[PDB]
């Protein structure tokens, strides 16, 4: 309360009033009866234990329901002291339910940031909050996470701190499902950096501030370009990230901004050509056809009605929450700031329209032949011109692909179905490349000469998602995540072990990563999936089926993580399941071989390679330089620098990444999505539960509980408990952020066993906290019983003072009455009586 001011307005969403707290922690609780329990419809609901069937349990509900469930379908419930705990990992009850429940409660109260160990859980508000508030930004500035409530800037500032304090590089790993809202955070983190450590001095003035011509802006402006090209309306989000990313903010020596570095991973090439019914393609398209810059429409040779471009109107065209017109400029302007040449800025556009046109390219069967022949030179003409090509040459190459099988170049004929498909392949190919280029070009501007001493990496990618249908793309992502996870499990193992070393506890344990090495080797190692995948890609006459068998003959029965599918449930077909940390994933191998080969009509590429549109020409260069290497039929593309695998890079990139991640001090952020239905203050259970498993959150709790469940971070320990031996615990906490907590525990009639200290935090038992209380319980009987007595004593002591006072007033009353009883019958007295009145 006193503290909170900085936020003030945000406060309510960060922390609760000091009595709201008090009124919550200090309330009646019946441990032995209060519990969490399994539940067929709702995941886990709370209840009170009624009876006990010797190994069965009957419980009442909170809604009113009675169920008799197993002994282990029943889970304890944390004392009220742990209501809306900033760090669930401090709880003395490391369960599945208690975690769900904590998140949930502090959300219904509008607190989106709750920590779960090292993580920084974040829940989608689905509404607006004063959190990103320009006051907060400062507030979180220079504060350990124990000096302030759960928030992202905490993570983000600490990184910075740590950055300069330890002279190590840092990282932030943001991860969640499609609708969790990571971009948002990522972006928000980024602003944070830019703000708290900028100072271009000259660039700071209110004169076209943030326009092209400064980075802090470039840095920023970056997003809105990428977003136009790599973002789209998903059925979950309205601006979903259809690719992954890694930015390196290169801080200087002083501590002020110096450089940036983007890298893109796994772009959703398919949107470019397809789209689900409730979705839509990349924004750009819709941006452009919006008509805010009419020249563009005529320049590209298109219309404003998307239904003229099959590729981009298979799903939806308009989204109410998006103003395509505004963005177009945003985008536009960003390009400029980004330093692109008008020409390039022209290529981009012109190139983005060609692609639309391609999808309009039509063909027909030559008569009496099964060959494809152009169905007109209306569109080709446009596509051709827009790309700096020749209509004819183009349609030929497309129709009569001139190949090179043997030591020559053999002209091959294609079918209608073959063309339509090849076209689509280029459309996608071109878009991609371009996108890649843009990134590079961005990076190029984001390159300064100033020295760099450290960087802070911000990684945004997807998390392990399980679908009834898991294809190639899923493997690639899952694999990424299963790696990331191990990356954590280790950091934690390293971390943990420091405490027990700092404190002096005697705990031995094996790396927690190790548990996952099994799965990883199976994928990335030499005779593993990828290899078998990338080898077969070399066999001119291999089949998905072929590949499949090779997969089995070699891993089946011999490998544990390897399994043959469970074809039924919500799944669509059979091929192979894997046993990832999050669970079993059923993978379908169909298209892999192809997808992995990235087959492109080289004749056409040829044309690109010699376009009048330099940029287009450029994008293709690297294909043109490896052809030397795969001159004759069969063989290896790599000889000339051409990719041999769809997967060959992914790995290379994923390695270059996980390596960059190592020379880093990992900082974790887990983004969460409350309800599919888009409702603030709400949460489906099992939906959040899921995420938690695949997040790593539930695994961090596990590893925690091995043991000493709840683990308190030192500052987070000071603040909350200083008050207990106030003088001696405050001194300890202030005098040494760590040494303090140490010193504090000096007092209390508590089990000095149940805990254990270490380099970053204390370890605590539960049933420990349970133990504590008990001791405490006895200690009040003492305190109370004694305080009762005096009272009791004293109580009667006042009775004597009254009894005594009364002493005579009674007598007076006593005797006085008696008189009358005697008198009232006496002549003389009756006389006096009748007579008493006549007097005066």
Swiss-Prot record:
Residues 83-777 form the Myosin motor domain. Residues 780-809 form the IQ domain. The modification Pros-methylhistidine is found at residue 752. Residues 835-837 are annotated as: Hinge. The modification N6-methyllysine is found at residue 32. Residues 30-79 form the Myosin N-terminal SH3-like domain. It is found in: Cytoplasm, Myofibril. Residues 654-676, 756-770 are annotated as: Actin-binding. It comes from the Eukaryota. The modification N6,N6,N6-trimethyllysine is found at residues 127, 548. ATP binds at residues 176-183. Muscle contraction. Myosin is a protein that binds to F-actin and has ATPase activity that is activated by F-actin. Belongs to the TRAFAC class myosin-kinesin ATPase superfamily. Myosin family. The rodlike tail sequence is highly repetitive, showing cycles of a 28-residue repeat pattern composed of 4 heptapeptides, characteristic for alpha-helical coiled coils. Limited proteolysis of myosin heavy chain produces 1 light meromyosin (LMM) and 1 heavy meromyosin (HMM). HMM can be further cleaved into 2 globular subfragments (S1) and 1 rod-shaped subfragment (S2). Muscle myosin is a hexameric protein that consists of 2 heavy chain subunits (MHC), 2 alkali light chain subunits (MLC) and 2 regulatory light chain subunits (MLC-2). This is Myosin heavy chain, skeletal muscle, adult. The chain holds residues 5 to 844 of 1939 of the full protein.
């Amino acid at each position: 309360d006193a503290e909170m001011a900085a936020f003030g307005e945000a406060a309510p969403y960060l922390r609760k009033s000091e009595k709201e707290r008090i009124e919550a922690q200090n309330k009646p609780f019946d441990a032995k009866s209060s519990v969490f329990v399994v539940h067929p419809k709702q995941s886990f609901v709370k209840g009170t234990i009624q009876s006990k069937e010797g190994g069965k349990v009957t419980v009442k509900t909170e809604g009113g329901e009675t169920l008799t469930v197993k002994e282990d379908q029943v889970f304890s419930m944390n004392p009220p002291k742990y209501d809306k705990i900033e760090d669930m990992a401090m709880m003395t009850h490391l369960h599945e339910p208690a975690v769900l429940y904590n998140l949930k409660e502090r959300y219904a109260a509008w607190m989106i940031y709750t920590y779960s160990g090292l993580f920084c859980v974040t829940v989608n508000p689905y509404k607006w909050l004063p959190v990103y508030n320009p006051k907060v930004v400062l507030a979180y500035r220079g504060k350990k996470r124990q000096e302030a409530p759960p928030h992202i800037f905490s993570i983000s500032d600490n990184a910075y701190q740590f950055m300069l304090t330890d002279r190590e590089n840092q990282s932030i790993l943001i991860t969640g499902e499609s609708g969790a809202g990571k971009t948002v955070n990522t972006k928000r983190v980024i602003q944070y950096f830019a703000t708290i450590a900028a100072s271009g001095e000259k660039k700071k003035e209110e004169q076209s501030g943030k326009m092209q011509g400064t980075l802090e802006d470039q840095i920023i402006s970056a997003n809105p370009l990428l977003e136009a090209f790599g973002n789209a309306k998903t059925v979950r989000n309205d601006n979903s990230s259809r690719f992954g990313k890694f930015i390196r903010i290169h801080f200087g020596a002083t501590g002020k901004l110096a450089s940036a570095d983007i890298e893109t991973y796994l772009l959703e090439k398919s949107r470019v050509t397809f789209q689900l019914p409730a979705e839509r393609s990349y924004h750009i398209f819709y941006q452009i056809m919006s008509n805010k810059k009419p020249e563009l429409i005529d320049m590209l040779l298109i219309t404003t009605n998307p239904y003229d471009y099959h590729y981009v109107s298979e799903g939806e065209i308009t989204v109410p929450s998006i103003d395509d017109q505004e963005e177009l400029m945003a985008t536009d302007s960003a390009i400029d700031i980004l330093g692109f040449s008008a020409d390039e800025k022209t290529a981009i556009y012109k190139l983005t329209g060609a692609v639309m046109h391609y999808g309009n390219l039509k063909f027909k069967q030559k008569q009496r032949e099964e060959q494809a022949e152009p169905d007109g030179t209306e569109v080709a003409d446009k596509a051709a011109y827009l790309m700096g090509l020749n209509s004819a040459e183009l349609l030929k190459a497309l129709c009569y692909p001139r190949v090179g099988v043997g030591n020559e170049a053999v002209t091959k004929g294609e079918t209608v179905s073959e063309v339509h498909n090849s076209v689509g392949a280029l459309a996608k190919a071109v878009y991609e490349k371009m996108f890649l280029w843009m990134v590079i070009r961005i990076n190029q501007q984001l390159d300064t000469k100033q020295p760099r001493q450290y960087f802070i990496g911000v990684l945004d990618i997807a998390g392990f998602e399980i679908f009834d249908f898991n294809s190639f793309e899923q493997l690639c992502i899952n694999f990424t995540n299963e790696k990331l996870q191990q990356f954590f499990n280790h950091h934690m193992f390293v971390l943990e072990q420091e405490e027990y070393k700092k404190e002096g506890i005697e705990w031995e344990f094996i790396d927690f990563g190790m548990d996952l090495a099994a799965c990883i080797e199976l994928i990335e190692k030499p005779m593993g999936i990828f290899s078998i995948l990338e080898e077969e890609c070399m066999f001119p006459k291999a089949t998905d089926t072929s590949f499949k068998n090779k997969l089995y003959d070699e891993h089946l029965g011999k490998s544990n993580n390897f399994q043959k599918p469970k074809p039924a449930k919500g799944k669509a077909e059979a091929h192979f399941s894997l046993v990832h940390y999050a669970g079993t994933v059923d993978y379908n191998i169909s298209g892999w071989l192809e997808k992995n080969k990235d087959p492109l009509n080289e004749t056409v590429i040829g044309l690109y390679q010699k376009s009048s549109v330099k940029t287009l020409a450029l994008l293709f260069a690297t294909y043109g330089g490896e052809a030397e290497g795969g001159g004759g039929k069969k063989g290896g593309k790599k000889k000339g620098s051409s990719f041999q695998t769809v997967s060959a890079l992914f790995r290379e990139n994923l390695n270059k990444l996980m390596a960059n991640l190592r020379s880093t001090h990992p900082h974790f952020v887990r983004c969460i999505i409350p309800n599919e239905t888009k409702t603030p203050g709400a949460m489906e259970h099992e939906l959040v539960l899921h995420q938690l498993r695949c997040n790593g959150v539930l695994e961090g709790i596990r590893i925690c509980r091995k043991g000493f469940p709840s683990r308190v971070l030192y500052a987070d320990f000071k603040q909350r408990y200083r008050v207990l031996n106030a003088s001696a615990i405050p001194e300890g906490q202030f005098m040494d952020s760590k040494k303090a907590s140490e010193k504090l525990l000096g007092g209390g009639d508590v089990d000095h066993t149940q805990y254990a200290f270490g380099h970053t935090k204390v370890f605590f038992k539960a049933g420990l906290l349970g133990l504590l209380e008990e001791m405490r319980d006895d200690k009040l009987a003492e305190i109370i019983t004694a305080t009762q007595a005096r009272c009791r004593g004293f109580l009667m002591r006042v009775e004597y003072r009254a009894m005594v006072e009364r002493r005579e007033s009674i007598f007076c009353i006593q005797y006085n009455v008696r008189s009358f009883m005697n008198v009232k019958h006496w002549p003389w007295m009756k006389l006096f009586f009748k007579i008493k009145p006549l007097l005066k």
